C-alpha cells in the first residue's frame, strides 16, 4: 500500500482512529493510538506521520531500555496498514505495523522487527538471497474447570482431524482463517490437533517477515476470537501433562539469484550442497538457537524424551525423532522443517536465528552428518553416543547458557537483544528456580 | 458432480472453506480444512487439489502407520461434494469425502473406504457384480440426568412408533432425513424404537460405497442437531441394561450382469442357489465377520442370549432370533437382512467382510443349512446341538480370535487393516480386562 | 539394656505387642508387629527373637532391592527397647529400633543405620576414634487454610523465641521433649523459629548412632503429637516461599584415643591440624556431601543465595554465610558446624558421609583455606572468585551428578546404597523436571 493508497482509504471509510503497532523483545505487541483530525490539514499531519514516523515512550516496553527513552520513534510500514484484523466491520479504526527507530532516524538496535530486516537485507545486498519460513502453530483452546473456577481446562475432549461434536471449535478455526485471509496474512491447513482442546492453523511458505506479521496478528487475533466464544487461547506450550504440548514446526528455505538453492536433482536425495550446509549449520548450532525458538521454562516440558520430541540433533528424510525433517517436495518447493520451535517465540528473532545459523553452514561450507532414520527415542544411549546423537538443552537455563556462548547468534540477533534477551530471560529462570511448587508441595509436604 | 460443476459451484456460492473427509481404521470421521483463495489463481490452485489431491500427515490417525506417514495424500471423490450437511445454510464452506492414497499416488492400504472400493471393483470386473446395502441404524438420544449431571439417561419415555407427546424426538427425525434426503444421502422409514429414548432411521437399498458414506454422514449429522436440542445422539450398542439395544440391520444382496441373482422363481421358497451359496458363506464366517460389524466390548451385551437376539448362527424366512432373516420381497428386491451388527462399526470394513463371506460361499458352492423357523431361544441347549445351531462369540476378545484365525477376513480387509484392527482391539480388551468395573464394586466391596 | 532386662520389662509390664524397627533409604521409618506368646515358651520365643532376629520380605521397602528379599532379617538394637515413644502410657506395646541382615546372618550393604555403624566401627578400630554429633532440627507446624480446606498454611503467626499467644506451639514443643527425654533420647534448646508456624528442637551432641536414632524417633513422635491438636508437622525444607526454610544444622566432632583431637591450645584459633584437615575434606566434598543431606528439589530451594544462605563453600569463627561456622567453645567442647544439612535427610546416611569426607581431609591432610569472615552475600562475584569460594550445587541434578563423581562418599555409603540413591533420585528429578508447574501456568497460560 503507498501513502496515497493509505490516505484515500482514509478519506472513503472515513477513518477517525489510528493504531500504531510494533513488538518487544518477548514478542508481546504492542500499540498507541491516536485520532485522525478532519480535514486536509488532517489528511497531511497524518501523511507526515506515515512518512516520518510518530515519537513515543518506550522506557516501559521490555527491551527497549537505552537512551532517550521517552522520545523514541514508531515508523509505518504501510505494506500492513488495514482495518484492524480482529474488529474488520469497524472500518473506522485502522492500524499499521511499524519498525522503531531512534530520535535521529535510525533503526532501533533493539527492535526484533528490524533485527529480521537486517539480516534479511545483509542476504538479499550480499547474495541476492530470499529467506522463506512456513510455520505450524498449535494452541490450545480453554474453559474454566466447573469444579474450580480459578482453573482452566481443555475447552473440548476432540482428537487429531476430528469432526463436531468432538470437535467443539470447527467455526473458530474457520473464523480465525476467514479474519487472515481476508486481509492477506495468508494461511494453509486448519484442524483439531491431538490433545484435546488442542488445534493447528498452518501458515503459507512465504517471505519471512511477512510470514512473522502473519504469526502475531494471528495470536491477537485468536485470542479475541475465543473471548467472544467465552474461551481462552493459549500458545503456552506445555499447559498440561500427559497430553500434547503445543509446537511452531519452521518450514524454510533460501533461494539465492531466484533459483530454488536447496534442490540439485543430481545430487543424494536431490538435496543440493547448500541445502546440507544450511542444515548442517541449524545442527551446529541448534542447543544456542533453541534459548530463542522454545524461551520459556514451559518450553522445556515439550522438549522432553519421547517417540516424536524434536530433541535429538540429527536430520531426517522421514523420521520425525529429529529436530530436522527434510519434506519430500523437490524443485521450487524443496525445503527443510525444524521442528523443535514452539508457538511461545517471538517469530522476528526465531526467524532471525534459524537464517543466521543456516547461512554460517553455508559460509562455512559444513558438512552435514548422515540421516538418521532409525527412531532416535527407541535406540539405546550407547547407539546415540555411537552415532553422534545429541540432544538440545533439558531447561531454559542450559539454552540460555548455550545462546550466551555462540557468537554466530550474538551477531545475529545484535548485541542489545542478545543482552537484553540474556538479562530478562535470567531473571525469568530465577524467578521459577527460587519458587515453592506445587509440584514440591505434592511430595514433600508428609516429609 | 464433475471438476466443472465443483468449480462453479464454488465461485457461485463464494466458497471461502473447503473440509477433505476420511475416515480412520475404528470408523471415526476425520478433516483437515483449507481457504479457498480469491480468483482465477485461486480456481486454479483448487482444480490441482481437486483431480490430484493433497498431501497431509496421517501419523496421528488410528491405523495408519505406514511409511511417510507425514506425506500422505487425500484425493477426493467429487461424488460426494457438498455444503456441510450439518451446516447446510452456510453456503461459503463445503466438505468432500475422500479416499487415502501414499505419496506414490497409489491407494492406502490401510484405507477403509479404498478397502470397500477395491473388493466391490474385483468383484465388478470379476464377475460384472454389483453389491448393494440398506442398512437400519438405531441410536440412543440422551439428557442429563437432572440428580446427577454426571450422568445420561435416556431422552424420553416413549416407545415403538409412539406419537408425540411420548415420542419427544418427530421434529429431530424429520429434520435428520430432511437433512440427508436434501444432499441425495438417501433415506426410507423413520420412528422411535421400542427402548426409552431409542430411534431408527433407515437407508435406501443401494450401492455399498454410497450406502456407507451415508451412514458415516448421519452419524454426525445426528450428533449435531440433537447437541441443538441441548440432547446427545449415541451409537453406543448397549448403553443401558434392562433395554433394548441398538443394531444396524443390513439388508444386501449381489447382482450379477444385472440381473437379480438371489432371485430364482422356480426354486425352492423362490431363492436361488447364489443366494444359498451367499448365506452359507455369511453363516459359515459368521463368529469372525462379529469381530468387525460388532467391535466393541458394549457390542457383546447386546448379542446375549434372548427371545430375538441375533446370536444364533442360522438363517430363516420369518424367524427374528436368526442371524439372517429373509425378506418376503422377491424378484428384483429379493435380499438376505443380517441382523448381528451394530451401528458402532465402521460402515465400509463391515460391508466388506460381508460381501467376501457371502463370495466365498458363492466361490466355493457351499450348501446352506436348512432355515430355522421355530424360536432357537425358546429351544433346549440339546435341540440347538442336534439342529447344529451354534452361537456368535460371547465377547469382543472370543471374536478378534476368530477374525485372527480366519484367512477369507484377512484377504478381504487385507493385511495392514487385518493386523492393525487385531492390534488395536486386544488392546482396548486389555484395558476393559485390567480395569475395576462398577459391577464388581457392587457385587465385591462387602466380601 | 540386655536380653535379661528386656525380658523382665516384658513379664513386669504383661508386654502382648512387639513392634520391630528400622528404615529406608530415603529415612522412612518402618516398622512391623508380633503378638507376644503367654508363657516361659512365649517368653522363650521373645528370647529367640531378640538374640537371632526375625525374617522379613523387604522386596517392598525403598532401597532394599536385591537377592532373596521375602526372607530378609531384623536384628534387634536391645539398646533401642522401650515403649513406644509416642503412646508411652501403654506399656503392652513395646518397640526396638534393629539393623537388617541377610538371610545368612551378616549385615545387608543396603541398610543405612548399618552403613553409620560400619563406617564408626572402621574409625574405632584403625585409629580409636569415636564421632559425636549434635543436630539442631527446624519444622513447621500447619493447619488448613480456612479458604480451601485442601491447603496447609502455617499454624501460627509467630516468630523467633516467641511467647504465647502468638508462638501456638509451646505445650506441643514442651511435650516433645518430655516424650524424647523420658526415654534417653537427649534433646536441648526449643523455641519458635522466625517463620511463622516454624519451630526447632536441638538435640544432645551425642554418638552419632545414639544421635541418627533420636532424629528418627523424634520425627515420628512431633507428627504423632501435631496430629493429637488437629496440625500437622513436617521437615520439608522450603514449604512456603518468602519465608525461612528449615535446616538442620549439624555440630561436629572426633575424638581419638579419648582426646578432643580438635583442641590445640597452641594453634591458631586454637583449633588443630587435625581439625583444619577435617574442616578441609568437609569443604573438598562439599558439593557431593550436599546430594545426601540436602536429598529433594525443594532442598535447593532452601539453598538459594541469601545473607544467611550457607550455600558458601567456606569456613568461619563467626560467619553465617558460611557453609561451616566454628563455635567458640574449646577443650573438649571444640566442634565444626556443618549448616548445609536439612531434615529431609536421612541421618544415618548425612552422618555417614559427613565423616567419610572430614576423614578424608585427615588421611591426606588437606590444607584448609582461610576463614571468611566477611558476610558472603554481600560481596561481588568477582570477590568470591578471587577468594576462591564456590557455591554449593543449585539443584537436586546437579548435587547428585556431584555424588556420581566422588569415590570417597561412594565408599563411604558402599555400592548398594550408593547406586539405589543415585537411582531413586534421578527418576525422583525426572519426575519434577517432566511435571508442569503452577509457576508455569502462572507465567504462561497469558502467551
Ligand atoms: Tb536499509
Ligand atoms: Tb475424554
Ligand atoms: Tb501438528
Ligand atoms: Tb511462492
Ligand atoms: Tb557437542
Ligand atoms: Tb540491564
Ligand atoms: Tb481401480
Ligand atoms: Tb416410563
Ligand atoms: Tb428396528
Ligand atoms: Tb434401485
Ligand atoms: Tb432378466
Ligand atoms: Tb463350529
Ligand atoms: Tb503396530
Ligand atoms: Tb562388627
Ligand atoms: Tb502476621
Ligand atoms: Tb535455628
Ligand atoms: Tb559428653
Ligand atoms: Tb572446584
Ligand atoms: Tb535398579
Not at 520459556?296 to 531426517?316: C, D, F, H, M, Q
Not at 553422534?388 to 542450559?398: F, H, Q, T, Y
Given at each position: 500500500?503507498?501513502?496515497?493508497?493509505?490516505?484515500?482509504?482514509?478519506?472513503?471509510?472515513?477513518?477517525?482512529?489510528?493504531?500504531?503497532?510494533?513488538?518487544?523483545?518477548?514478542?508481546?505487541?504492542?500499540?498507541?493510538?491516536?485520532?485522525?483530525?478532519?480535514?486536509?490539514?488532517?489528511?497531511?499531519?497524518?501523511?507526515?506521520?506515515?512518512?516520518?514516523?510518530?515519537?513515543?515512550?518506550?522506557?516501559?516496553?521490555?527491551?527497549?531500555?537505552?537512551?532517550?527513552?521517552?522520545?523514541?520513534?514508531?515508523?509505518?510500514?504501510?505494506?500492513?496498514?488495514?482495518?484492524?484484523?480482529?474488529?474488520?466491520?469497524?472500518?473506522?479504526?485502522?492500524?499499521?505495523?511499524?519498525?522503531?527507530?531512534?530520535?535521529?532516524?535510525?533503526?532501533?538496535?533493539?527492535?526484533?522487527?528490524?533485527?529480521?530486516?537486517?539480516?534479511?537485507?545483509?542476504?538479499?545486498?550480499?547474495?541476492?538471497?530470499?529467506?522463506?519460513?512456513?510455520?505450524?502453530?498449535?494452541?490450545?483452546?480453554?474453559?474454566?474447570?466447573?469444579?474450580?473456577?480459578?482453573?482452566?481446562?481443555?475447552?473440548?475432549?476432540?482428537?487429531?482431524?476430528?469432526?463436531?461434536?468432538?470437535?467443539?471449535?470447527?467455526?473458530?478455526?474457520?473464523?480465525?482463517?476467514?479474519?487472515?485471509?481476508?486481509?492477506?496474512?495468508?494461511?494453509?491447513?486448519?484442524?483439531?490437533?491431538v490433545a484435546p482442546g488442542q488445534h493447528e492453523v498452518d501458515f503459507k511458505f512465504d517471505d519471512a517477515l511477512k510470514t512473522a506479521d502473519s504469526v502475531i496478528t494471528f495470536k491477537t487475533t485468536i485470542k479475541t476470537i475465543a473471548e467472544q466464544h467465552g474461551l481462552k487461547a493459549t500458545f503456552m506450550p506445555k499447559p498440561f501433562f500427559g497430553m500434547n504440548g503445543s509446537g511452531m514446526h519452521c518450514h524454510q528455505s533460501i533461494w539465492l539469484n531466484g533459483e530454488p538453492s536447496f534442490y540439485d536433482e543430481n545430487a543424494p536425495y536431490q538435496l543440493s550442497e547448500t541445502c546440507m550446509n544450511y542444515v548442517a549449520g541449524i545442527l551446529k548450532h541448534a542447543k544456542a538457537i533453541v534459548a530463542?525458538?522454545?524461551?520459556?521454562?514451559?518450553?522445556?516440558?515439550?522438549?522432553?524424551?519421547?517417540?516424536?520430541?524434536?530433541?535429538?540433533?540429527?536430520?531426517?528424510?522421514?523420521?520425525?525423532?529429529?529436530?530436522?525433517?527434510?519434506?519430500?517436495?523437490?524443485?521450487?518447493?524443496?525445503?527443510?522443517?525444524?521442528?523443535?520451535?514452539?508457538?511461545?517465540?517471538?517469530?522476528?528473532?526465531?526467524?532471525?536465528?534459524?537464517?543466521a545459523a543456516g547461512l554460517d553452514g553455508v559460509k562455512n561450507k559444513l558438512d552435514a552428518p548422515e540421516p538418521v532414520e532409525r527412531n532416535i527415542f527407541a535406540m539405546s544411549e550407547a547407539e546415540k553416543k555411537e552415532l553422534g546423537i545429541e540432544s538440545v538443552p533439558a531447561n531454559l537455563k542450559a539454552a540460555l547458557d548455550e545462546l550466551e556462548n555462540n557468537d554466530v547468534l550474538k551477531n545475529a540477533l545484535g548485541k542489545h537483544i542478545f543482552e537484553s534477551f540474556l538479562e530478562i530471560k535470567n531473571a525469568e529462570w530465577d524467578s521459577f528456580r527460587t519458587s515453592v511448587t506445587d509440584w514440591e508441595t505434592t511430595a514433600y509436604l508428609k516429609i
Amino acid at each position: 500500500s503507498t501513502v496515497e493508497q493509505v490516505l484515500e482509504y482514509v478519506k472513503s471509510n472515513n477513518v477517525k482512529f489510528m493504531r500504531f503497532q510494533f513488538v518487544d523483545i518477548l514478542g508481546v505487541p504492542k500499540n498507541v493510538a491516536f485520532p485522525i483530525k478532519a480535514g486536509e490539514k488532517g489528511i497531511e499531519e497524518l501523511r507526515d506521520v506515515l512518512e516520518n514516523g510518530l515519537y513515543f515512550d518506550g522506557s516501559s516496553i521490555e527491551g527497549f531500555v537505552g537512551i532517550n527513552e521517552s522520545d523514541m520513534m514508531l515508523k509505518p510500514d504501510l505494506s500492513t496498514f488495514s482495518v484492524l484484523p480482529w474488529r474488520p466491520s469497524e472500518k473506522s479504526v485502522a492500524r499499521v505495523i511499524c519498525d522503531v527507530y531512534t530520535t535521529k532516524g535510525k533503526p532501533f538496535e533493539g527492535d526484533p522487527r528490524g533485527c529480521l530486516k537486517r539480516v534479511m537485507e545483509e542476504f538479499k545486498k550480499e547474495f541476492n538471497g530470499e529467506y522463506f519460513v512456513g510455520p505450524e502453530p498449535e494452541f490450545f483452546l480453554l474453559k474454566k474447570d466447573p469444579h474450580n473456577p480459578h482453573k482452566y481446562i481443555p475447552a473440548d475432549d476432540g482428537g487429531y482431524f476430528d469432526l463436531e461434536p468432538m470437535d467443539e471449535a470447527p467455526d473458530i478455526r474457520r473464523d480465525i482463517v476467514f479474519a487472515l485471509e481476508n486481509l492477506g496474512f495468508h494461511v494453509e491447513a486448519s484442524h483439531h490437533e491431538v490433545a484435546p482442546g488442542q488445534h493447528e492453523v498452518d501458515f503459507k511458505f512465504d517471505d519471512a517477515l511477512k510470514t512473522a506479521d502473519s504469526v502475531i496478528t494471528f495470536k491477537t487475533t485468536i485470542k479475541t476470537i475465543a473471548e467472544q466464544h467465552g474461551l481462552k487461547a493459549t500458545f503456552m506450550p506445555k499447559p498440561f501433562f500427559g497430553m500434547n504440548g503445543s509446537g511452531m514446526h519452521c518450514h524454510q528455505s533460501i533461494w539465492l539469484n531466484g533459483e530454488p538453492s536447496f534442490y540439485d536433482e543430481n545430487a543424494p536425495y536431490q538435496l543440493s550442497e547448500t541445502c546440507m550446509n544450511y542444515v548442517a549449520g541449524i545442527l551446529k548450532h541448534a542447543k544456542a538457537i533453541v534459548a530463542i525458538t522454545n524461551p520459556t521454562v514451559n518450553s522445556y516440558k515439550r522438549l522432553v524424551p519421547g517417540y516424536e520430541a524434536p530433541v535429538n540433533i540429527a536430520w531426517a528424510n522421514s523420521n520425525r525423532s529429529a529436530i530436522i525433517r527434510v519434506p519430500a517436495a523437490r524443485g521450487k518447493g524443496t525445503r527443510i522443517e525444524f521442528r523443535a520451535p514452539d508457538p511461545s517465540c517471538n517469530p522476528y528473532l526465531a526467524f532471525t536465528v534459524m537464517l543466521a545459523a543456516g547461512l554460517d553452514g553455508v559460509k562455512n561450507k559444513l558438512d552435514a552428518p548422515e540421516p538418521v532414520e532409525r527412531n532416535i527415542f527407541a535406540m539405546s544411549e550407547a547407539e546415540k553416543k555411537e552415532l553422534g546423537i545429541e540432544s538440545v538443552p533439558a531447561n531454559l537455563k542450559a539454552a540460555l547458557d548455550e545462546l550466551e556462548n555462540n557468537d554466530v547468534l550474538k551477531n545475529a540477533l545484535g548485541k542489545h537483544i542478545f543482552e537484553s534477551f540474556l538479562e530478562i530471560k535470567n531473571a525469568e529462570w530465577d524467578s521459577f528456580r527460587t519458587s515453592v511448587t506445587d509440584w514440591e508441595t505434592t511430595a514433600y509436604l508428609k516429609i
